Ligand binder design. Structure first.
Ligand code: CHL
Ligand code: CHL
Ligand code: CHL
Ligand code: CLA
Ligand code: CLA
Ligand code: CLA
Ligand code: CLA
Ligand SMILES: CCCCCCCCCCCCCCCCCC(=O)OC[C@H](CO[C@@H]1O[C@H](CO)[C@H](O)[C@H](O)[C@H]1O)OC(=O)CCCCCCCCCCCCCCCCC
Ligand SMILES: CC1=C[C@H](O)CC(C)(C)[C@H]1/C=C/C(C)=C/C=C/C(C)=C/C=C/C=C(C)/C=C/C=C(C)/C=C/C1=C(C)C[C@H](O)CC1(C)C
Ligand SMILES: CC1=C[C@H](O)CC(C)(C)[C@H]1/C=C/C(C)=C/C=C/C(C)=C/C=C/C=C(C)/C=C/C=C(C)/C=C/C1=C(C)C[C@H](O)CC1(C)C
Ligand SMILES: CC1=C(/C=C/C(C)=C\C=C\C(C)=C\C=C\C=C(C)\C=C\C=C(C)\C=C\C2=C(C)CCCC2(C)C)C(C)(C)CCC1
Lengths: 35, 50, 44, 37, 61, 50, 222, 243, 222
């Protein structure tokens, strides 16, 4: 029954990791402006 | 300050901040003395002026 | 007891971890995304 | 209460908290006196 | 001993009041900080002296 | 705050027998396991994070 | 970070002084740590460089092989208590169950250390002999210290500057792993417990559960 | 190195630039002596030659007070920590040897030596030797040598030197020929001396106020700062509990 | 004279029986008796490095060998000054008793209880001074790495060249004497576990049956 917990914890860490490295990954340069 | 009452009905917020440091606190929680609170306030006021 | 329960509610479990496999797969997923990001860093 | 040596100054003490609120209001007087430059 | 401390505290109140009403005006005065240096030093030295006096008078009062 | 809790004999413990006491703290628990488990746990009523 | 050239980092920081004339910074792992000067002759320098690198690789392999089994033993994998701690792993082959990889009855299950060491001698003698020639069946003649080719299927040795900084990464990680391996041999001699168990007991109370707690174990008696 | 921070027309003052103008310093302080901070509010500085005259008194005073501060802090600390010093507290050390008393030397690490020297002979040798070394200071003549500054120097080495800063036998470690490091160590020495003499005045005042030694003062202050300080020891006892 | 130890006919490691002297050891530097039967000093710059770490080893062995017996010399009849810690190879346990680390039996001296803190201060300070030794700083920078003598020589002494030669071979011989004696210290700690002065007293009581032959049975693998 802990299998559901493992699956949801894995997908939550996956989405959070996408967020963390997406904003670590030179986010302010993703702009059309001169900056 | 009213000394005979427990010290939370007098609308005082930061004398609990000094009293949590135990400065003038009895065994059961009696206030005992108010001079540490007074000297704390005056030192803060002089520091504020400078 | 009448049913099998996780019985981890409370007890001060860090990050809600009660078995080591969950912490290992959390670290594995974060490390996998980190390896992908690191090898594919500097755009190219 | 204050100790015996400081008891007569308690009414002078009893007006302080409004002074920080008067500081931003003094800043408003400043900004109006410079005619909102 | 109580009267000495009370008079010292009253003088300290008046000195701090004078400092409050004077320091910003003297500072923002055009060519005033370089000419009122002596009186500002006198006021600050007196202010600190009365503070230390009330401090040493607490232990006798 | 360390100096006050261990060497200046202050701060009130509410959990002393009889209704608490101002207690000079001896042998504080500084271990990384309990401190970090205190900082990385859930913020709900099961444990409370901080 | 300019790991080559004259401006390379040194083995004592700014207080390093002058690096040796026979070490100008062509090779990875260069910091000028040459207090005794064992590497004066370039041939001797080459032999020591190969020895250092082979030991770096072996130390990295030993580091994972000494950390992973006890981690799995404490993480639900049914290792026996005998083979969970590395210096006693060789004693697991003397038991009735044999050598159970990952605590599995039908996995490996070897009971003849004589034949195990015999095939080990044959296989590793062949491997090291093919290493010594620089020529193997199906492998042409090239650099003996850095073969690549069949040993680099990924193809990360193609680009020069990344290959050089990866050389630096490899030699520095090897030096870290050999610190670790010598440390593990030290705790094995002194503590008699696994290194992860040593760190675990050190985290319980770092004030007393450190290296100073074992200073009086080897003291002689009259 | 870095002599501009202490020497030159622009230097550290007793007040910063926002409160003290650079023209309020009197003319005879232009940044050439050690400790030049421009702090002469009264009429004691007058001119540079009188400044140079008081410089000798100031430097010898600073060194004497520095020796006094060290020889005050060390023996009382040894007495409070367990050493058999027998009179480590500084303002009772003369009361030991009146009738038949003695003293003990704790010369680290091999101290604990019982001194049988009487006070009269001690005072005699002290006054004679200090008078002799003072005459050597003011007139610049020394009978013998064998100093680590230079091996077996003659008597005529003090002539041609500088008063209050003579090189040679008084520099056993040398390292004072270079003017930059010499001036830096000069400013360091004079600031260390004023720190030491302010300390000395504090030890005397705290002695006369609390009646105990200053190491005992600071150890009790660290034992409890609010339960042992200026206002606490000047309060007296108990203090009615003010509700 | 000088030529007794720096000439081509100098003192050797066999006196007049050192016919096959190595060619590179001509007697220029202190010592140079020719005892290089292993031939490990063939290369010149390596011979320089080995000589420098020789003099460093010699000086710190002089400190060690002299400081071995001084607490045991000051040991009294029963030991109020020091208990079991008067012996050299039991000195470290002077930090773990109930009182602290007293230098000469009293709380006024040293009196430390944080071995970790004194370890950190020792490491930082003397690693820094090793950096000064190999690079330079407050004392001197461009001087001889082995023989600076500027701030460390304040008592004259070092000014005369034949005096340099004489009391430099005095250095190397005193250092080697302490070096050999220190080997004696460690091995008598191993084979007996008894202090040097008490072993000396036991031998001078009866040299006949008290010798290392009395402990030759101790290492027998029964
Ligand atoms: C050259 C340095 C050095 C040496 C030889 C020793 C030796 C010793 N210390 Mg020790 N220490 C040294 C430095 C330091 N110690 C300490 C702190 C302590 C403590 C706290 C304690 C000791 C104790 C001991 C003894 C442990 C009993 C034993 O059989 O040990 C192994 C020794 C032998 C088997 C004898 C043969 C020694 C020989 C092989 C050494 C020479 C070669 C070495 C590899 C050294 C190489 C240089 C570097 C690595 C130090 C032992 C004789 C303990 C003690 O006294 O217990 C009664 C103790 O409690 N030491 C510090 C920190 C301040 C040191 C800092 O440098
Ligand atoms: C954990 C508890 C602990 C306690 C209770 C003490 C207690 C003490 N330690 Mg300490 N220590 C402790 C831990 C540690 N000590 C040290 C390292 C030392 C050292 C190295 C020394 C002490 C000393 C002392 C004593 C200092 C008091 C004194 O003499 O005051 C009175 C003295 C002063 C206030 C200042 C005196 C300074 C001294 C250098 C004066 C020199 C004067 C000269 C003119 C110098 C001239 C030199 C050149 C320029 C010409 C004292 C009994 C000292 C001692 O034992 O002295 C006998 C000492 O030398 N400790 C370490 C390692 C970091 C510790 C680690 O835990
Ligand atoms: C140079 C400054 C100096 C100062 C400020 C003091 C100050 C003092 N000495 Mg004194 N002494 C000084 C120099 C000398 N004393 C003595 C010898 C003594 C003795 C024998 C005694 C004092 C004592 C005293 C105290 C009371 C008199 C104290 C106030 C007395 C004391 O300590 O009373 C408690 C005491 O008995 N002094 C000698 C000759 C060795 C000195 C030489 O310069
Ligand atoms: C035995 C493995 C080994 C070998 C063969 C080498 C070989 C070499 N190293 Mg290297 N090194 C090693 C381990 C090794 N190293 C480790 C563990 C470290 C980290 C401390 C370093 C850090 C290092 C640096 C920073 C540099 C070198 C350099 C060099 C080259 C010249 C130095 C030399 O000739 O010394 C010969 C080495 C030996 C003869 C090994 C002797 C081993 C004995 C048994 C030592 C016994 C005591 C020892 C200190 C262990 C105590 C514990 C320890 C973990 C602290 C040479 C090819 C220089 C270079 O530029 O590389 C090209 C250089 O800058 N090494
Ligand atoms: C983290 C340590 C490390 C690093 C940075 C390198 C780096 C390098 N190695 Mg190398 N190697 C290592 C460890 C390492 N090695 C070990 C331990 C061995 C012994 C098995 C070898 C044996 C070896 C050989 C025979 C050769 C190289 C070669 C090379 C170079 C090109 C290959 C490459 O870029 O692939 C990429 C490297 C990495 C991505 C870093 C490795 C990280 C992996 C993914 C971790 C693996 C651990 C995992 C749990 C599996 C356990 C190990 C198992 C395979 C036994 C390169 C600079 C070739 C060469 O010399 O160049 C011409 C070559 O001939 N290595
Ligand atoms: C580790 C200490 C050490 C070191 C680094 C040196 C180094 C050196 N010695 Mg020296 N020596 C030593 C100890 C040491 N010695 C001691 C204790 C003695 C007294 C017995 C001597 C007596 C001696 C003489 C008479 C001469 C030298 C000479 C030399 C120089 C050339 C010889 C050489 O390279 O051999 C190589 C040395 C090493 C590679 C390091 C030695 C460490 C070994 C490998 C381990 C211990 C050896 C052995 C097991 C000790 C146990 C036996 C013991 C009972 C003696 C060289 C720089 C010759 C010279 O020209 O003077 C400058 C010379 O003639 N030595
Ligand atoms: C008997 C051994 C011995 C001998 C013959 C020498 C000889 C020499 N040393 Mg040397 N030294 C020694 C031991 C020795 N040293 C030790 C053990 C250390 C480490 C502390 C040093 C550290 C050292 C340094 C840093 C320097 C020298 C230098 C020199 C040269 C000139 C200065 C000098 O020391 O004159 C000789 C003086 C004596 C022989 C007097 C020794 C008598 C003592 C006082 C006996 C008492 C011992 C005492 C109990 C030890 C505890 C004291 C401790 C706290 C320091 C000279 C060739 C200088 C140099 O490099 O050459 C230019 C230099 O810079 N030495
Ligand atoms: C904005 C304002 C923020 C204001 C206040 C926020 C305060 C605290 C927030 C963090 C406190 C808790 C730290 C993590 C601990 C924890 O969550 O434990 C994990 C807990 C514990 O989970 C439960 O724990 C129990 C015992 O404690 C039992 O073990 C249960 O079985 C287990 O499920 O579950 C969660 O709280 C879910 C966390 C999900 C986090 C996703 C965040 C994604 C959004 C943004 C990412 C940004 C970066
Ligand atoms: C450089 C120099 C120079 C200067 O001048 C001088 C001097 C000082 C000499 C120097 C230095 C040196 C050094 C330090 C060296 C060292 C090295 C090392 C440490 C190595 C190791 C190295 C290390 C290594 C290899 C290791 C390895 C390991 C191994 C195999 C292991 C294995 C295993 C495992 C897995 C587990 C199991 O259960 C068991 C076994 C099976 C057993
Ligand atoms: C030359 C040659 C040639 C041929 O052919 C070959 C060959 C053989 C190689 C050779 C030879 C060699 C040799 C002899 C060597 C030796 C070495 C040694 C002696 C070491 C030791 C060495 C040793 C040493 C240093 C020692 C030292 C010591 C010390 C520091 C001590 C310290 C201490 C003290 C004070 C006290 C305390 O309580 C403790 C301590 C703290 C601990
Ligand atoms: C009146 C009275 C009294 C008395 C008192 C006294 C006598 C004293 C005092 C006191 C005090 C005396 C206090 C204080 C304060 C202080 C402060 C407030 C400080 C400060 C400082 C700072 C803030 C700094 C800044 C800076 C600079 C400028 C430099 C560099 C950077 C930095 C940032 C560090 C009492 C309360 C007892 C009681 C009641 C009455």
């Amino acid at each position: 029954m802990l299998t559901l917990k493992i699956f949801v914890y894995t997908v939550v860490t996956f989405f959070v990791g996408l967020f963390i490295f997406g904003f670590l990954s030179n986010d302010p340069s993703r702009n059309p402006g001169k900056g | 300050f009213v000394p005979e009452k427990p010290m939370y009905e007098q609308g005082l917020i930061l004398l609990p901040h000094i009293a949590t440091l135990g400065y003038g606190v009895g065994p059961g929680g009696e206030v005992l003395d108010t001079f540490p609170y007074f000297v704390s306030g005056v030192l803060h006021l002089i520091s504020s002026a400078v | 007891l009448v049913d099998d329960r996780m019985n981890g509610d409370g007890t001060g479990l860090p990050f809600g971890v009660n078995d080591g496999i969950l912490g290992w797969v959390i670290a594995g997923t974060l490390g996998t995304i980190w390896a992908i990001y690191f090898v594919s860093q500097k755009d190219l | 209460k204050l100790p015996e040596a400081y008891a007569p100054f308690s009414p002078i003490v009893d007006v302080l908290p409004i002074i920080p609120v008067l500081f931003i209001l003094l800043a408003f007087v400043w900004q109006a006196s410079v005619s909102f430059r | 001993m109580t009267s000495i401390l009370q008079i010292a505290l009253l003088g300290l109140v008046l000195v701090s009041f004078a400092l409050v009403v004077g320091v910003p005006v003297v500072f923002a005065s055009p060519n005033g900080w370089t000419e009122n240096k002596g009186v500002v030093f006198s006021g600050l030295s007196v202010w600190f002296l009365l503070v230390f006096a009330v401090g040493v008078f607490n232990s006798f009062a | 705050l360390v100096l006050k809790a261990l060497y200046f004999g202050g701060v009130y413990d509410t959990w002393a027998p009889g209704g608490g006491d101002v207690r000079i703290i001896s042998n504080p628990t500084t271990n990384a396991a309990i401190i970090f488990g205190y900082i990385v746990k859930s913020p709900f009523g099961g444990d409370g994070w901080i | 970070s300019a790991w080559y050239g004259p401006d390379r980092p040194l083995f004592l920081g700014s207080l390093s002084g002058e690096p040796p004339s026979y070490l100008t910074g062509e090779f990875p792992g260069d910091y000028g740590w040459d207090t005794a000067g064992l590497s004066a002759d370039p041939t001797t320098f080459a032999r020591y460089r190969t020895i250092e690198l082979i030991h770096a690789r072996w130390a990295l392999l030993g580091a994972l092989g000494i950390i992973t089994p006890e981690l799995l033993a404490k993480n639900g994998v049914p290792f026996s208590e005998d083979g969970a701690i590395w210096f006693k792993a060789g004693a697991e082959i003397f038991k009735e169950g044999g050598l159970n990889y990952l605590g599995n009855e039908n996995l490996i299950h070897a009971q003849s250390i004589l034949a195990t060491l015999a095939v080990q001698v044959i296989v590793m003698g062949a491997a090291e002999g093919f290493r010594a020639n620089g020529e193997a069946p199906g492998v042409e003649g090239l650099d003996p210290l850095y073969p690549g080719g069949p040993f680099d299927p990924l193809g990360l040795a193609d680009d020069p500057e990344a290959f050089a900084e990866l050389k630096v990464k490899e030699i520095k990680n090897g030096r870290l792993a050999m610190f670790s391996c010598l440390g593990f041999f030290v705790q094995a001699i002194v503590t008699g417990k696994g290194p992860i168990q040593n760190l675990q007991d050190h985290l319980a109370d770092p004030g007393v559960n450190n290296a100073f707690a074992s200073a009086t174990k080897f003291v002689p008696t009259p | 190195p870095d002599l501009e921070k202490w020497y030159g027309p622009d230097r550290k003052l007793f007040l910063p630039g926002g409160l003290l103008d650079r023209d309020d310093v009197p003319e005879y302080l232009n940044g050439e002596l050690a400790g030049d901070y421009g702090y002469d509010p009264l009429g004691l500085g007058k001119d540079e030659e009188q400044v140079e005259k008081y410089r000798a008194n100031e430097l010898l005073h600073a060194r004497w007070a520095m020796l006094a501060a060290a020889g005050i802090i060390i023996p009382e600390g040894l007495q409070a920590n367990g050493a058999d010093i027998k009179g480590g507290t500084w303002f009772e050390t003369g009361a030991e040897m009146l009738n038949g008393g003695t003293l003990n030397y704790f010369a680290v690490p091999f101290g604990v030596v019982q001194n049988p020297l009487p006070l009269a002979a001690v005072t005699l040798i002290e006054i004679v030797l200090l008078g002799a070394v003072e005459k050597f200071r003011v007139d610049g003549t020394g009978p013998a040598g064998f100093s680590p500054g230079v091996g077996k120097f003659d008597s005529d080495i003090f002539d041609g030197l500088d008063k209050l800063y003579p090189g040679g036998p008084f520099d056993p470690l040398n390292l004072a020929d270079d003017p930059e490091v010499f001036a830096e160590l000069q400013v360091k020495e004079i600031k260390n001396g004023r720190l030491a003499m302010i300390a000395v005045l504090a030890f005397a005042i705290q002695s006369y106020v609390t009646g105990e030694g200053p190491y005992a003062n600071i150890t009790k202050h660290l034992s409890d700062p609010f339960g042992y300080n200026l206002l606490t020891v000047l309060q007296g006892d108990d203090r009615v509990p003010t509700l | 004279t000088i030529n007794q130890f720096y000439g081509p006919d100098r003192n050797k490691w066999l006196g007049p029986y050192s016919t096959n002297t190595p060619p590179y050891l001509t007697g220029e530097f202190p010592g140079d008796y020719g005892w290089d039967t292993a031939g490990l000093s063939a290369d010149p710059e390596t011979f320089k490095r080995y000589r420098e770490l020789e003099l460093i080893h010699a000086r710190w062995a002089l400190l060690g060998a002299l400081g071995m017996v001084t607490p045991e010399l000051l040991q009294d009849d029963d030991g109020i000054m020091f208990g079991e810690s008067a012996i050299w190879f039991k000195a470290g346990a002077a930090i773990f008793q109930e009182g602290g680390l007293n230098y000469l039996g009293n709380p006024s001296l040293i009196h430390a209880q944080n071995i970790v803190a004194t370890l950190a201060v020792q490491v930082v300070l003397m690693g820094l001074v090793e950096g000064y030794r190999v690079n330079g700083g407050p004392a001197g920078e461009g001087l001889d790495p082995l023989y600076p003598g500027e701030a460390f020589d304040p008592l004259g002494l070092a000014d005369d060249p034949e005096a340099f030669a004489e009391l430099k071979v005095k250095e190397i011989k005193n250092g080697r004497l302490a070096m050999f004696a220190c080997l004696g210290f460690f091995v008598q700690a191993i084979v007996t576990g008894k202090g040097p002065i008490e072993n000396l007293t036991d031998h001078l009581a009866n040299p006949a049956e008290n010798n290392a032959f009395a402990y030759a049975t101790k290492f027998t693998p029964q």
